[PDB]
A paper describes a structure:
EhCaBP5 is one of the EF hand calcium-binding proteins of E. histolytica. Sequence analysis of the calcium binding protein 5 from E. histolytica (EhCaBP5) indicates that its size (16.3 kDa) and secondary structural arrangement are similar to those of CaM like proteins but it also suggests the presence of two calcium binding loops in two separate lobes. The overall structure of EhCaBP5 is more similar to that of the essential light chain (ELC) of myosin than to CaM. Taken together, our structural studies show that EhCaBP5 resembles ELCs, and the functional studies indicate that it is likely to be the ELC of myosin 1B.
We have determined the crystal structure of EhCaBP5 at 1.9 Å resolution in the Ca2+-bound state, which shows an unconventional mode of Ca2+ binding involving coordination to a closed yet canonical EF-hand motif. The final refined structure contains 131 residues, one calcium ion, 40 waters and 3 acetates; six residues from the N-terminus could not be modelled due to missing electron density. Overall, the molecule is divided in two globular lobes, where each lobe has four alpha helices connected by loops. The N-terminal lobe has one EF-hand motif with a calcium ion bound to the loop between two helices. Taken together, these results suggest that the C-terminal lobe of EhCaBP5 cannot bind Ca2+. In EhCaBP5, the Ca2+ is coordinated by one carboxyl oxygen each of residues Asp16, Asp18, and Asp20, the hydroxyl oxygen of Tyr22, and two water molecules (instead of one, as observed in CaM). The extra water also binds to the 12th position glutamate of the EF hand loop; this residue is usually critical in directly coordinating Ca2+, but, in EhCaBP5, it is too far away, at a distance of about 4.1 Å, and cannot directly coordinate instead it coordinates the Ca2+ via the intervening water molecule. Overall, the Ca2+coordination geometry is octahedral in EhCaBP5, instead of being pentagonal bipyramidal as is typically found in CaM. The r.m.s.d. between these EF-hand motifs is indeed relatively large, at 2.38 Å, and the interhelical angles of the EF-hand motifs of EhCaBP5 and CaM are 64.3 degrees and 89.3 degrees respectively, indicative of the closed and open conformations respectively. The extensive hydrophobic interaction between these two helices could be the reason for the observed closed state of the lobe and water mediated Ca2+coordination or intermediate state in EhCaBP5.
Residue numbers in the entry:
A (entry chain A), B (entry chain A): 8 to 146
């Protein structure tokens, strides 16, 4: 990963800025709110920025605290093999409980309420993934 | 402050996004790292974003945890009334110790080392304020 770190270190000093950190972690597959990524940066950077070894520690921890888009998609596709485009909201709740731990049950309900998803109904998978990316980028 | 909050709430739902929060807090005079602002947002927002009452609590706390540019400038100008453009680095250290508490002594030293400022020397005030704004925006 050192090659990739240094690639994203735009000024060649061995430290990432906050935008370079966010951009690298997203490139590497992390799916989560910008402010949560920024918060990890704030707690694990020196004045100069984030060094390679703080980065690998943070990146390991981000990786546990979240999922990637391959992971969510595989789990969704398992329940829509016919490609109808929809899954049950409660099965989405299961998946999101299962694959990353940056949502508790109460945060899932608040997310479903925000998006207009009923607990006994279905969710349109493309719209959900798109809205959730968008949400994450702005929060 | 409610009028200003709702002004920066771009979609009229009563909640700020992370960029609207950062932009409003900066407009209101807060001087501090983006990732520290983002970290406060991450800890004090619901799924929908940041409500007016979470905002006024956060904003009060940001205000204590930092300074504004009027505050630093007044304190600098007190030591350069002749407008030479320079102050002693140790007097800058005093000021930064004094007027916001998001720097400890060790973070001041690391900042001075980063900018090439010697402890027994002087600091060029315009260059310092400019570099520090820049630093804060990218970290
Ligand atoms: Ca760098
Ligand atoms: Ca809003
Ligand atoms: Na490490
Ligand atoms: Na409040």
């Amino acid at each position: 990963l050192k090659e990739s770190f240094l690639l994203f270190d735009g000024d060649g000093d061995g430290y990432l800025t906050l935008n370079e950190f966010e951009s690298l972690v997203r490139v590497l597959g992390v799916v989560m709110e910008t402010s949560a990524i920024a918060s990890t940066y704030n707690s694990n950077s020196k004045v100069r920025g984030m060094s390679y070894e703080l980065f690998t520690s943070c990146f390991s921890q981000l990786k546990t605290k979240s999922f990637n888009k391959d992971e969510i998609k595989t789990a969704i596709n398992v329940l829509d093999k016919d490609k109808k485009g929809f899954i049950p909201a409660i099965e989405l709740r299961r998946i999101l409980s299962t694959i990353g731990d940056n949502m508790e049950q109460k945060e899932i309900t608040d997310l479903f309420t925000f998006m207009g998803i009923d607990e006994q109904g279905v969710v349109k998978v493309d719209d959900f993934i798109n809205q959730d990316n968008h949400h994450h980028h702005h929060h």
